[PDB]
Amino acid sequence: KASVDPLGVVGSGADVYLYFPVAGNENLISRIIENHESKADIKKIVDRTTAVYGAFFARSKEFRLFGSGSYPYAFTNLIFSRSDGWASTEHGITYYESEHTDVSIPAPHFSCVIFGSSKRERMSKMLSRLVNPDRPQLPPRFEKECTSEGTSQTVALYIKNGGHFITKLLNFPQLNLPLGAMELYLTARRNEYLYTLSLQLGNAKINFPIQFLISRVLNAHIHVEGDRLIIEDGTISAERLASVISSLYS
Amino acid sequence: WKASVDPLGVVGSGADVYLYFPVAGNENLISRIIENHESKADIKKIVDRTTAVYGAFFARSKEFRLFGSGSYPYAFTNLIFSRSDGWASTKTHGITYYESEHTDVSIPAPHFSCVIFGSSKRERMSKMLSRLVNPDRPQLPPRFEKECTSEGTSQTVALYIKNGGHFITKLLNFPQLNLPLGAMELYLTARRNEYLYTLSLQLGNAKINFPIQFLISRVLNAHIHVEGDRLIIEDGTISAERLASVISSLYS
């Protein structure tokens, strides 16, 4: 009802968690949607969305999104059609289905989206977590960004397998590195994004030579704190950040 | 003596760095290096009438010795080395010497020039000129020797550095890890306002694992590998500005 935790709704067990405030990241958003057919229809729902919470699950090849915004029936009614591949609304809930995408508006301020393979979660199962949320575990700063609405426009990512990810961000061919979770926080500076990340190292030590070289490939400050590798003052353009976000599914 | 001379025998054996610059295609770099030390036009004017420059840097006595082949008519030489620019001259055979605070210059024949630059311990000019008659015999790697004989057909700059450790860190702008390595060969060619280069660096018992190898190749954006105990980098790049600074910083 009023106490809904968006992260409880996308669900636990994901490989990547995403928090994406729209204000201040409109350009990044528009760059990402430029590939899809529904790009006219999506930029509409997006214009009515304040924040997007997302979880990606590799095993079932799916993304689940929860949006906070304003979605009256009059607005949803226009966008939805059979000409765009959809089928379908009922007891205050607008429910929509296509080959690879499910959408529902369970209330005037929430939207839910499941996209992916034929093994993606049923929508009624995701909606049940409005009554009985999951309890995923998320890093402190990720949690802070999620509750901090409007005082911050940081995009937050929590990626369980950082080794397998970090290759995409570093211009690498996929190497399979023996590293753990990464947190990644990005903020728009003009046509660019500043980022800071933390990487779990486990018991393997990272000496200064490697520390130095990474720092040069990335053009950023670098340091070890306990068993974490910390990268700060890194920068990436809005354009390359777009494709990297898309590569999660690909 | 005029019959034929080996410019490398004239600059002398035992140097810490050997250098070869063909002037065509490398005018800008040469200018930069000259500017980083000397402001006098005479040397710039000499360079303009030179086809090739052979150099040797000597760390102990802190000096460059340079041999230029070119065209230096009396009409040209008479109009440089003016006393108002701080040049003293002296006749004697018929060879004239030009001396200044840090630079000594001679033009022993209309097609040769000799320059000695550096500290007060720099070689005497007449000692260097004696090597027109009795040359030294420094040892250089094959490609360095190929470059020296191939003016007109190649515009590649060549360096041969005895202590490659110290130089490579300046060149790649790394920190000087200073676990001294062997000799370095370095060949560079001009592309716009930067230089393309390949190098090999003797490693010794020193080791370079694959992780560092791949990282360096990405840092430099160049193809790299290890042929034996030689590290090879191909298609690295450096700005002319930086290359001029790295060279000229051998002195002082």
Interface test with A, best of B219, B221, B224 (most A CBs within 10 A): B219
Domain count across chain B: 1
8 A C-beta contact, residue B81 and residue B98: yes
With CA atoms as reference, report the closest residue to A126 among A95, A156, A157: A95
Euclidean distance between the first and final Cα of chain A, in Å? Answer: 35
8 A C-beta contact, residue A51 and residue A67: yes
Test A216 with B212 for CB contact under 8 angstroms.
no
Q: Which are the contacts of B212, defined by CB distance < 8 A and separation ≥ 6? A: A209, A210, A213
8 A C-beta contact, residue A54 and residue A194: no
B95 Cα to chain A: minimum distance (Å) = 54
What resolution in angstrom units was achieved for this structure?
2.4
Q: Which two tokens stand for residue A18?
A: 């995403």
Q: Is B212 on the interface with A (CB under 8 A)?
A: yes
- Is residue A229 within a helix (H) or strand (E), and if so which, with residue range? strand A228-237
Tell me the C-alpha distance between A124 and A72, whole Å.
20
For chain A, how big is the Rg over CA atoms in Å?
A: 19
- Residue B203 CA: distances (Å) to CA of A124, B215, B218: 65, 18, 20
- Give B-chain residues touching A177 at CB under 8 angstroms: none
- State whether the Cα torsion B170-B174-B178-B181 is positive or negative: negative
Q: Report the amino acid identity of residue B74.
A: Y
3-state secondary structure of B235: strand
- Is residue B82 within a helix (H) or strand (E), and if so which, with residue range? none
- Residue B23 CA: distances (Å) to CA of A2, A38, B236: 79, 61, 22
A199 Cα to chain B: minimum distance (Å) = 18
Of the CA atoms within 13 Å of residue B193, those in its CB half-sphere come to: 3
- Residue A56 CA: distances (Å) to CA of A241, A249, B112: 17, 8, 74
Q: Report the amino acid identity of residue B238.
A: I
- Is residue B197 within a helix (H) or strand (E), and if so which, with residue range? strand B194-202
If you count residue pairs, one on A and one on B, with CB atoms under 8 Å apart, how many are there? Answer: 17
Test B218 with A217 for CB contact under 8 angstroms.
yes
3-state secondary structure of B111: coil
Tell me the C-alpha distance between A146 and A9, whole Å.
13
8 A C-beta contact, residue B92 and residue B108: no
Q: Is A212 on the interface with B (CB under 8 A)?
A: yes
Of the CA atoms within 13 Å of residue B217, those in its CB half-sphere come to: 17
- Is residue B232 within a helix (H) or strand (E), and if so which, with residue range? strand B230-239
> Residue A90 phi/psi, 5° resolution?
-160, 120
For tokens 């004697």, name the residue.
Answer: B92
- Residue A24 CA: distances (Å) to CA of A67, A176, A240: 16, 34, 17
Q: Report the amino acid identity of residue A209.
A: P
Which structural technique was applied?
X-ray
For chain B, how big is the Rg over CA atoms in Å?
A: 19
CB neighbours (10 Å) of residue B127?
11
> Residue A204 phi/psi, 5° resolution?
-65, 130
The DSSP annotation for B3-51 comes to: T---HHHHH-SS-SEEEEEESTT-HHHHHHHHHTT---HHHHHHHHTEE
Helices (H), chain A: 6-10, 26-33, 39-47, 73-79, 123-127, 140-147, 162-169, 208-218, 238-246
Tell me the C-alpha distance between A143 and B122, whole Å.
69
Q: Report the amino acid identity of residue A103.
A: V
> Residue B245 phi/psi, 5° resolution?
-65, -45
Q: Which two tokens stand for residue A19?
A: 């928090």
Q: Catalogue the long-range contacts made by A206-211 (C-beta closer than 8 Å, 24 or more residues apart).
A: A209/B177, A209/B212, A210/B211, A210/B212, A210/B215
Tell me the C-alpha distance between B104 and B102, whole Å.
7
Q: Which chain A residue lies closest to B212 (C-alpha atoms)? A: A210
Tell me the C-alpha distance between B219 and A214, whole Å.
8
Domain span at residue A28? 1-250
Q: Which residues pair with A169 in a beta bridge?
A: none
With CA atoms as reference, report the closest residue to A214 among A193, A197, A226, A238: A197
Helices (H), chain B: 7-11, 27-35, 41-48, 74-77, 125-129, 142-149, 164-172, 210-220, 240-248
Q: Report the amino acid identity of residue B167.
A: F
Cα Dmax for chain A = 63
With CA atoms as reference, report the closest residue to A123 among A91, A98, A154, A155: A98
